[PDB]
Amino acid sequence: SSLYKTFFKRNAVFVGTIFAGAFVFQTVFDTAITSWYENHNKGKLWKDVKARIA
Amino acid sequence: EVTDQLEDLREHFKNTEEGKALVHHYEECAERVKIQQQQPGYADLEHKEDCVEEFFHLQHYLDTATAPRLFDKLK
Amino acid sequence: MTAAEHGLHAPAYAWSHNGPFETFDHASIRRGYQVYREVCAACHSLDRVAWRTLVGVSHTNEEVRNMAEEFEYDDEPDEQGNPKKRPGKLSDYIPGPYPNEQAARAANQGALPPDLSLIVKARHGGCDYIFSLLTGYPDEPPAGVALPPGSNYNPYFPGGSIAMARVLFDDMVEYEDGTPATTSQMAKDVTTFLNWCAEPEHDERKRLGLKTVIILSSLYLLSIWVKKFKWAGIKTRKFVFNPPKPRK
Amino acid sequence: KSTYRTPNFDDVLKENNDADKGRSYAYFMVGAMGLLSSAGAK
Amino acid sequence: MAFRKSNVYLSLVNSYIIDSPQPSSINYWWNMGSLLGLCLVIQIVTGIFMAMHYSSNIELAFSSVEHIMRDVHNGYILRYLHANGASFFFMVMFMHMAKGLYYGSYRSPRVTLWNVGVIIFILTIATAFLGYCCVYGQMSHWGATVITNLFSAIPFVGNDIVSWLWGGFSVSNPTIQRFFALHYLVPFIIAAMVIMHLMALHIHGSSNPLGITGNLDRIPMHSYFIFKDLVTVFLFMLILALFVFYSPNTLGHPDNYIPGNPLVTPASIVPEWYLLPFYAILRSIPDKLLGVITMFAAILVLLVLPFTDRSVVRGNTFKVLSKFFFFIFVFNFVLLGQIGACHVEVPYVLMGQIATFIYFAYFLIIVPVISTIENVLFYIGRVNK
Amino acid sequence: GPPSGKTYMGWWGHMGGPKQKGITSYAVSPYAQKPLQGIFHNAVFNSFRRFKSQFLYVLIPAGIYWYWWKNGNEYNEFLYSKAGREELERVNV
Ligand SMILES: CCCCCCCCCCC(=O)OC[C@H](COP(=O)(O)OC[C@H](O)COP(=O)(O)OC[C@@H](COC(=O)CC)OC(=O)CCC)OC(=O)CCCCCCCC
Ligand SMILES: CCCCCCCCCCCCCCCCCC(=O)OC[C@H](COP(=O)(O)OCCN)OC(=O)CCCCCCCCCCCCC
Ligand code: HEC
Ligand code: HEC
Ligand code: HEC
Ligand SMILES: COc1c(O)c(C)c(C/C=C(\C)CC/C=C(\C)CC/C=C(\C)CC/C=C(\C)CC/C=C(/C)CCC=C(C)C)c(O)c1OC
Ligand SMILES: CCCCCCCCCCCCCCC(=O)OCCCOP(=O)(O)OC[C@@H](O)COP(=O)(O)OCCCOC(C)=O
Ligand SMILES: CCCCCCCCCCCCCCC(=O)O[C@H](COC(=O)CCCCCCCCCCCC)COP(=O)(O)O
Ligand SMILES: CCCCCCCCCCCCCCCCCC(=O)O[C@H](COC(=O)CCCCCC)COP(=O)(O)OCCN
Ligand SMILES: CCCCCCCCCCCCCC(=O)O[C@H](COC(=O)CCCCCCCCCCC)COP(=O)(O)O
């Protein structure tokens, strides 16, 4: 790695880094997994059926 | 004139040679039972011979064949 | 038991909602509701399905409202204590055709038609059993079977003798989207609709399962790394032994 | 054999210690496990 | 001294989960205890948050369970975790008791620990049965009926005992209400017995998979077995998450989604999957009273175990014939479960009787004879004369 | 607090093992140690050793009971068929 210990030296900034990482990870993982789960089921959801019904 | 898909597949797999031999055994059983049910005393016997098991063999062969193809041929 | 009392084994039909990622086919649920309302609902209650669960799943808001306002429910009584009725709303449940059990047994030759809210989850085989039950009636029973009068044969029912009639014939309903409505098509549609009625959480259950399995697999591999890490001082530990001076 | 002759650890030692590299990799992995544990607890 | 040693409360946390001297050779089979503790916490927390929505009337039980699975936010998660976690609780407990039989943890000086373990096992079977009757499905109603008629087999007193249990004349509204109260109650007795279990463990420490002492090379609890238990905790949560989210109704019986009907008997009344060996043991005896006595003796014969193991070495690790007959016993227990799942038909009656006899013969004849022969074989293998 | 009985495990310092002398330990910090260097070649050859020394004690009871279950289940589905109904009559009575 390198000489950066402003992330790992102090436990305050380390646990703040872990909390900020999880705060981003919840949003990003949820949006990505919803997009994949709807992309894998194209045509079966109610969004596609409601768009099909004129 | 779009008939049902399932009986199309069932006739198509009654027409194979395993289907032909298996319906041959089943119709032979049915003819056995039909000539059983004319002699007197048939109303009062110990038991009855029926073709439940031959029909189970025939039906099991047919739906074991037609289970993976049917939902392909359906909407 | 023989195979007759146990019933014939329903085969493995390849549904569009098997597999750990595939969801329900909501157009098939809409068509399954149509076949339900025009065939089953003369004789089967659906007592555990509220109207609000169909909003956004198989029908829109106004469609569910204008299907629920065709029915009458018990209102609170008026200012003289007289009982009065009201049209339905979104918060009510789908009503059965029969007011009590005895009317059901009277109108169906003694046999009680079971409530279909959980019928694909309360039978072994499930979807395959319901589909093979509907599309499994022979034109005539096998030779040597004396049916009790008023009962019907199909091999998938346990015992062979069922008190249902064959109620799926070619093109008895019309579909809104123009799908050819054969017997197997309608049976597949109602079996998908009853799978929705027993398991309305199915879509969200599988996507939360995807999230949970991904996060726990990553945690399991990370924890294997940290266990191999913090035990590295103890796995590689070595012991030598020179035996001590025996004079002491 | 003396008690001053350390036995062979050379098959399992790092070829480069570099005490910020190893501790940074270890704390990265422990932090990743804590990350996903925080998400799961939430 | 340190604050974790001088404080009154943290000294227990210290001496149990921080500085507890564990033998440094124990493998992952010494992790089922922590896993059972985690699964008990899962069962209790889901039980509270699911019993905030449960009404225990006989006319409102099944409807309230379906109200949980339909109307409550994330309620399907709660019920599926709860039922499938009870299944995993018995599976991890069976693996834990098999670890106990294999490595000889029942032997002296750990007889108190083994007896408190058997008491925990009986209380857990009672809790699972009461909670399964709280669903009030078809299997719930008829299983409650069959088990209480088995209690009616007791001579000269039993009918009044059963009218006391039922609170009436059959399985009715007071029966389901008192089963819910008892089912809420008995897990806290299980928690108290678990604390007594940990005390009886802590006065001598864990065993090791060699059967020799472990007083020489001890390593602490903290970070070592903390992270080893964290590994198996994440594996257990992974497998539980699979059987909850992707296939929840596999372990259950599909008849339990039929509402409780006292008039219709089912085609095959079967308990949930883990009580099937005991149900097979009871069904193999052609008498009601001897059947109930044999079913309870099939658990008390675990109490008679440290007095029959005449092997002078601890555990089946370094013994051939004892290890072989142990796996005979384990696959016999699986065969008891599979006999019990079947009907009362030829030849399952004769196989159920033979399998029950091999169960009791392992606990009463095979272990002392094979241990004596193994002792004499160890002696004459190395002593020359 | 009261005294208690003689146990077989003490604590750190007076654990109760035999007195030991001239046995030296050697351990290296895990920060200077590479973890999971022994997963490859290890999970193949050591896992095959651990399987070879230990499988047959599991495989013979599984074989015996699975063969006995299979023979019993085959005899069940024989005598509840049409072919063995008179044998079912004579062994059920
Ligand atoms: C069914 C539902 C139960 C739910 C409970 C969830 C937990 C399951 C627990 C199963 C178990 O505890 O078996 C432990 C058994 C004995 O362990 P051992 O100490 O002798 O092996 C030392 C290891 O090489 C050290 O290696 P290390 O400690 O570095 O990593 C161990 C492994 C973790 O895996 C497990 O914990 C069990 C799967 O990390 C991996 O590399 C996994 C790679 C994907 O592990 C084995 O090695 C397998 C031997 C056969 C056991 C078959 C079990 C059938 C019932
Ligand atoms: C009423 C009383 C309750 C009784 C409970 C009945 C049993 C419940 C079943 C739970 C399964 C638990 C299996 C047994 C657990 C202990 C096995 C064990 O200790 O593993 C170690 C064993 C030998 O390892 P060693 O310790 O001897 O190695 C020393 C190296 N020289 O390693 C081995 O020999 C291999 C271990 C493989 C386990 C196989 C498990 C089979 C599970 C059943 C499968 C069912 C489907 C057929
Ligand atoms: C309120 C506290 C509560 C505790 C504590 C609790 N449960 Fe339950 N349990 C319930 C309730 C309520 C039900 C019925 C609702 C249900 O089954 O979903 C239930 C049902 C069950 C069922 C049947 C599940 C089903 O749907 O078939 C089992 C099995 C079970 N419990 C086992 C256990 C075990 C084993 C433990 C602990 C050792 C335990 N329970 C602790 C509340 C609890
Ligand atoms: C003629 C009236 C009638 C109609 C119409 C009807 N059913 Fe039935 N159904 C019954 C009766 C009666 C039973 C009870 C059978 C029994 O108890 O033996 C029954 C039972 C069932 C069962 C359970 C069978 C079993 O063995 O558990 C299913 C599933 C079922 N019906 C599906 C349907 C479906 C789907 C429809 C709509 C297509 C439908 N039924 C329409 C009368 C009807
Ligand atoms: C019938 C046997 C038995 C049952 C059931 C049982 N235990 Fe144990 N438990 C033992 C034995 C024996 C040991 C010690 C074995 C050894 O160390 O060799 C033990 C040890 C433990 C340990 C220490 C770690 C370990 O694996 O040795 C914990 C923690 C524990 N039990 C908790 C529980 C919990 C929690 C339950 C369920 C509520 C439970 N036990 C049920 C017999 C049992
Ligand atoms: C041998 O060395 C050991 C060892 O000594 C120990 C202790 C353990 C650990 C074992 C255990 C911890 C098992 C013991 C389990 C218990 C004592 C169960 C305790 C659980 C409870 C008492 C129930 C939990 C109750 C709550 C969390 C109350 C809060 C709940 C609710 C619902 C309140 C919510 C309400 C509102 C309004 C928010 C080991 O695993 C171990 O091996 C490493
Ligand atoms: C690996 C899992 C990690 C997850 C983290 C959560 C785990 C939490 C586990 C906490 C375990 C604490 C419970 C243990 C316990 O209650 O036992 C107390 C028994 C004390 O008696 P003793 O062991 O003889 O100690 C020595 C005593 O005799 C000292 O005498 P005195 O000072 O009076 O103490 C007696 C305490 C009385 O209380 C109880 C309950 O007994
Ligand atoms: C009562 C319930 C019993 C459940 C049995 C659980 C047994 C395992 C408990 C694991 C606790 C881990 C604490 C380790 C620790 O604090 O080390 C601390 C710091 O370690 C860590 O930060 C670990 C990273 C965070 C891991 C979080 C795991 C949370 C998921 C728990 C899931 C089960 C509840 C001390 O570590 P050190 O002495 O090596 O410096
Ligand atoms: C399920 C438990 C069954 C019974 C087992 C008992 C084990 C309990 C384990 C609890 C572990 C966590 C407790 C941490 C508390 C330590 C704080 C402490 O001791 O500080 C104490 C003060 O404690 C308090 O005021 C509040 C304690 C409430 C605890 C409620 C949880 C400091 O007191 P100190 O020890 O320094 O004595 C100096 C005298 N002036
Ligand atoms: C209180 C004890 C509960 C333990 C549950 C363990 C059983 C595993 C299945 C958990 C599924 C329920 C959660 C869920 O559905 O989340 C789903 C996501 O999956 C997970 O992240 C679960 C990871 C579990 C990590 C466990 C961490 C330990 C926390 C200890 C308590 C503070 C749903 O996520 P979402 O609602 O979208 O935010």
UniProtKB/TrEMBL annotation, chain C:
Signal peptide range in chain numbering: none
Localization per record: Mitochondrion inner membrane
Keywords: Electron transport, Heme, Iron, Membrane, Metal-binding, Mitochondrion, Mitochondrion inner membrane, Respiratory chain, Translocase, Transmembrane, Transmembrane helix, Transport
Reaction catalyzed: a quinol + 2 Fe(III)-[cytochrome c](out) = a quinone + 2 Fe(II)-[cytochrome c](out) + 2 H(+)(out)
Biased composition (Acidic residues): 70-79
Residue ranges of coiled coil: none
Cofactor notes: Binds 1 heme c group covalently per subunit.
Name by which UniProt lists this protein: quinol--cytochrome-c reductase
TrEMBL record, chain E:
Gene Ontology terms: cellular component: mitochondrial inner membrane; respiratory chain complex III
Positions of heme b b566 binding: 96, 197
GO molecular function terms attached to this record: metal ion binding; oxidoreductase activity; quinol-cytochrome-c reductase activity
Entry binding sites for a ubiquinone: 202
Record-linked InterPro entries: Cyt_b/b6_C, Cyt_b/b6_C_sf, Cyt_b/b6_N, Cytb/b6-like_sf, Cytochrome_b, Cytochrome_b_C_euk/bac, Cytochrome_b_N_euk/bac, Di-haem_cyt_TM
Subcellular location, principal: mitochondrion
Signal peptide: none
Pfam family, one: Cytochrom_B_C
Membrane-traversing stretches: 28-55, 76-98, 113-135, 147-169, 181-203, 224-246, 289-308, 320-339, 359-380
Compartments where found: Mitochondrion inner membrane
Domain Cytochrome b/b6 C-terminal region profile: 211-381
Source taxon at top rank: Eukaryota
Cofactor note: Binds 2 heme groups non-covalently.
Domain Cytochrome b/b6 N-terminal region profile: 1-210
GO annotation (BP), single: mitochondrial electron transport, ubiquinol to cytochrome c
Keywords tagged on the record: Electron transport, Heme, Iron, Membrane, Metal-binding, Mitochondrion, Mitochondrion inner membrane, Oxidoreductase, Respiratory chain, Transmembrane, Transmembrane helix, Transport
Role, per record: Component of the ubiquinol-cytochrome c reductase complex (complex III or cytochrome b-c1 complex) that is part of the mitochondrial respiratory chain. The b-c1 complex mediates electron transfer from ubiquinol to cytochrome c. Contributes to the generation of a proton gradient across the mitochondrial membrane that is then used for ATP synthesis.
Family: Belongs to the cytochrome b family.
Protein name in UniProt: Cytochrome b
Primary gene name: CYTB
